[PDB]
Design a protein around this ligand. Structure first.
Ligand SMILES: Nc1ncnc2c1ncn2[C@@H]1O[C@H](COP(=O)(O)OP(=O)(O)OP(=O)(O)O)[C@@H](O)[C@H]1O
Lengths: 61, 271, 141, 131, 73, 56, 122
């Protein structure tokens, strides 16, 4: 009982620690991915802000 | 715009034919599931009848005095009718309620003070629309009939008989003997023989021709059903059982199981 | 009808088109059994659900024409069953996100479908990887 | 390593696996069975059939029936036996309060026996769903 | 192959270059929509598209041609 | 003669308490691991839509 | 009736209303010959919501109060959208069908339902 119980609590606390490190990785993942995705949403927006002048010129001709 | 009218009418008849053949096929699949339930619930009652037959052959000289198996001939009657759940029914519920009227006709004529325990939704609709017949309890099929409906009906019939108020609790139902003809039967339920056979309303042991375990096989190219006589029953041997409980209490605890078995099998056969 | 037939398709399209046609035919067969879907065999329920979520990828909005690679990947996903678990109000959104994701991230798939005009095993593997990745990213919601 | 045990409701066989130690709540009280028991065919009250899998002690929720002990092939024909613990006790006490409530209104002679049996089944339901 | 951009046509009723395929339907079921989707889908391929508006309303043709000019087809 | 078995049982006591608080921490940390990417993905689409209104 | 012209909420509620009415139009013969009681749970709900929608599309006119016997009502777009959204969202499933008949807006539907329940109790 003591070997299996210490094994259970030890494995579960090491699960806490390794999934805590994995939590650190996911927090960094979300922060970095928001830093990336801001750029792509601004990219499609600026595609619109240029395409308005593009269609302006297309009808200017 | 008459040709579009005929075109849409033809389309509606095509769709109605499609959905009627779909209902036919899914009803056949549910017939297969009902025979599955029946042949799966059988061996419980097989071991029950072999145990009970041995027990009552050891308990004839005794005094057993169990309230379910006593014969109180002061002649009240509790006829229980079980009908179909939903509609289109072929001609199920009509002939069921018709035999119900015929039975209460012979009953009231003899002044035996009958009553009715309606089980099916169509039957209980018929009875709430006709209050000239007295009725005790109401049941339905939205609840599953394989366990809970049968358990509730057994509870109510047990509470009706053990509290010795009415005699002769019989059940009118419809054993599946043919795909076109389904003639209803009236079998008694609680005033049972201690040997433990299903009886007629006369009592003349219709287990002789009960024809258990129906199955479905086609004959040439159309669907039919096959019903044989005897299957996988081993009732003969009677070993020493060493009763720890008092023998009257053993049957007193055994007979509710037989009540539940008979009620459940009758529900499954009518379904 | 089309009297020209499969000769008007590229080699990539026929492979998924055969399975799409067979599964849509089975759904058209079992369409009457939809009201009694509860009391049916599991294979029949599978064919019915596959049909009513293959019908959902044949919906399109006006003036948004799919390229041949996008529809190859859409038909492949639907006809194999990498959306047999989703709900009917999610198939269209998931397919839009998956198509944009694959076009943005895995251009080897578009290039192998476009230059060789066949559904290569490498395209199959790339599409399964992209399906798993977008399945995780969409289960995130 | 034990006797063959089959708990059988009317409609189905619940489970026919073999376990070590069974406490059988009869009409005469609780009785324990052993592997290689001499055959005793008893009754069973609306009560608790506890088992022992030699790894963990488990309870079974049943609403009555009958039992038979044979040559290590024992058969217990029950009324309503739900395998293991399928329910949680909150809806059990929500059934206990309403069963004791309707015991009062159900006061006629047949309703006495009916409400009493409903009570003995609710009590065995909750004392089986304690674990 | 003639890519019509609609997945249901491209997989089930495929159209080839040199085939004559009939967009037959009822009133207001999407026939002009299907033709316009095909003409927009012809952007990458070098297909010279022709749209013959026979007995249409003039503002309908104006809407179609402005949609063409907007999408770049 | 009592504290010697008191310790040997108190080990199992602290063990089960640790596993209980452990399971609580597991569900909370997986909740936060879902929550950080969920918050990023939701708020990025929020700002997308809001700035897209002014863009239109 | 296109999203870029009419707004996404307007277009989506119009598409939902039309899909519900078309599904009710297709259930019309499986109901009329095979029984409304045997229907499934999703389809009975569709049928009830479609009958309620069909009642709610009616509206008394100011130049037709000589036929309807009731004063006409002007219904703006927003209250129409909100009413049909209430109907097919699942809130108003406890109202009678006649509560939606010849009412201006959805608050008038609820008021007529209240008067109907009053007449039904006493
Ligand atoms: N794939 C689609 N997705 C969304 N809306 C569509 C689609 N196809 C057509 N519509 C809509 O259906 C309506 C009618 O479309 P369209 O003009 O193509 O039909 P039509 O048959 O040409 O009409 P008519 O019979 O007057 O010529 C339009 O409002 C259009 O927006």
């Amino acid at each position: 009982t003591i070997r299996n119980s210490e094994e259970l609590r030890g494995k579960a606390i090491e699960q806490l620690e390794k999934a805590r490190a994995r939590l650190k990785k996911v927090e960094m993942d979300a922060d970095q991915f928001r830093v990336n995705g801001y750029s792509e949403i601004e990219r499609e927006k600026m595609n619109l802000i240029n395409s308005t002048y593009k269609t302006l010129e297309q009808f200017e001709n | 715009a008459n040709l579009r009218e005929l075109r849409d009418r033809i389309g509606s008849v095509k769709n109605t034919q499609k959905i009627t053949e779909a209902m036919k096929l899914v009803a056949a699949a549910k017939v297969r599931r009902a025979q599955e339930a029946v042949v799966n619930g059988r061996p419980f009652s097989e071991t029950l009848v072999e145990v009970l037959y041995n027990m009552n052959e050891q308990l004839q000289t005794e005094d057993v005095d169990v309230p379910l198996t006593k014969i109180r001939t002061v002649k009240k009657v509790a006829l229980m009718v079980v009908t179909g759940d939903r509609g289109l029914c072929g001609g199920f519920n009509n002939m069921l309620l018709k035999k119900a009227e015929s039975r209460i006709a012979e009953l009231k004529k003899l002044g035996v003070d009958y009553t009715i325990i309606s089980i099916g939704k169509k039957g209980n609709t018929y009875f709430i629309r006709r209050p000239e017949i007295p009725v005790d309890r109401y049941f339905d099929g939205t609840n599953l009939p394989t366990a809970k409906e049968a358990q509730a009906i057994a509870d109510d019939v047990f509470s009706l008989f053990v509290s010795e108020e009415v005699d002769k609790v019989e059940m009118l139902y419809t054993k599946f003997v043919s795909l076109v003809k389904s003639d209803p039967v009236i079998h008694t339920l609680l005033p049972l023989s201690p040997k433990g056979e299903i009886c007629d309303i006369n009592g003349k042991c219709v287990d002789a021709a009960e024809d258990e375990l129906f199955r479905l096989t086609t004959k040439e190219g159309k669907l039919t059903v096959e019903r044989d006589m005897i299957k996988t029953e081993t009732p003969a041997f009677s070993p020493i059982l060493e009763f720890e409980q008092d023998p009257a209490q053993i049957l007193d605890a055994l007979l509710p199981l037989y009540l539940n078995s008979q009620i459940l099998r009758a529900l499954q056969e009518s379904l | 009808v089309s009297r020209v037939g499969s000769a008007a398709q590229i080699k990539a399209m026929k492979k998924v088109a055969g399975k799409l046609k067979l599964e849509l035919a089975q759904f058209a067969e079992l369409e009457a059994f939809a009201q009694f879907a509860s009391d049916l065999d599991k294979a029949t329920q599978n064919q019915l659900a596959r049909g009513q979520r293959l019908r959902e990828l044949l919906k399109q909005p006006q003036s948004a024409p799919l390229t041949v690679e996008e529809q190859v990947m859409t038909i492949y996903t639907g006809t194999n069953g990498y959306l047999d678990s989703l709900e009917l109000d999610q198939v269209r959104k998931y397919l839009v996100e998956l198509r944009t994701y694959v076009k943005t991230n895995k251009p080897e798939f578009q290039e192998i479908i476009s230059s060789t005009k066949t559904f290569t095993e490498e395209a199959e593997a790339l599409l399964k990887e992209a399906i798993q990745e977008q399945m995780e990213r969409f289960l995130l919601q | 390593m034990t006797l063959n045990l089959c708990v059988l409701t009317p409609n189905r066989s619940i489970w026919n696996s073999e376990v070590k130690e069974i406490i059988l709540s009869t009409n005469s009280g609780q009785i324990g069975v052993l592997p290689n028991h001499a055959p005793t065919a008893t009754a069973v009250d609306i009560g608790i059939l506890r088992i022992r899998l030699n790894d963990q002690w488990l309870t079974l929720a049943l609403m009555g029936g009958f039992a038979r002990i044979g040559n290590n092939e024992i058969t217990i024909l029950v009324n309503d036996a739900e395998r293991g613990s399928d329910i949680d006790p909150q809806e059990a006490q929500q059934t206990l309060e309403i069963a004791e409530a309707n015991l009062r209104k159900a006061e006629g002679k047949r309703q006495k026996i009916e409400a009493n049996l409903a009570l003995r089944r609710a009590r065995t339901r909750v004392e089986a769903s304690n674990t | 192959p003639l890519q019509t951009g609609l997945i249901a046509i491209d997989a089930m009723i495929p159209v080839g270059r040199g085939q004559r395929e009939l967009i037959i339907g009822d009133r207001q079921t999407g026939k002009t929509a299907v033709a316009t989707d095909t003409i927009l889908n012809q952007q990458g391929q070098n297909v010279i598209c022709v749209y013959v508006a026979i007995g249409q309303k003039a503002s309908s043709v104006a809407q179609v041609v402005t949609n063409f000019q907007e999408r770049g087809a | 003669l009592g504290d010697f078995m008191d310790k040997r049982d108190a080990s199992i006591k602290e063990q089960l308490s640790g596993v209980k608080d452990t399971s609580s921490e597991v569900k909370q940390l997986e909740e936060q691991a879902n929550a950080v990417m969920r918050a990023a993905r939701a708020e990025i689409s929020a700002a997308l839509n809001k700035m897209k209104k002014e863009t239109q | 009736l296109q999203p870029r012209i009419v707004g996404e909420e307007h277009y989506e509620i119009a598409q939902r209303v039309k899909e519900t009415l078309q599904r009710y139009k297709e259930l019309q013969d499986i109901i009329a010959i095979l029984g409304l009681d045997e229907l499934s749970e999703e389809d009975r709900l569709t049928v009830a919501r479609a009958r309620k929608i069909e009642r709610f599309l009616s509206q008394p006119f100011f130049v037709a109060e000589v036929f309807t016997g009731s004063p006409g009502k002007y219904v703006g777009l927003a209250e129409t959208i909100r009413g049909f959204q209430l109907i097919l969202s699942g809130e108003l499933d406890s109202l009678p069908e006649q509560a939606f008949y010849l009412v201006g807006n959805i608050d008038e539907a609820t008021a007529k339902a209240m008067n109907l329940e009053m007449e039904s109790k006493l």
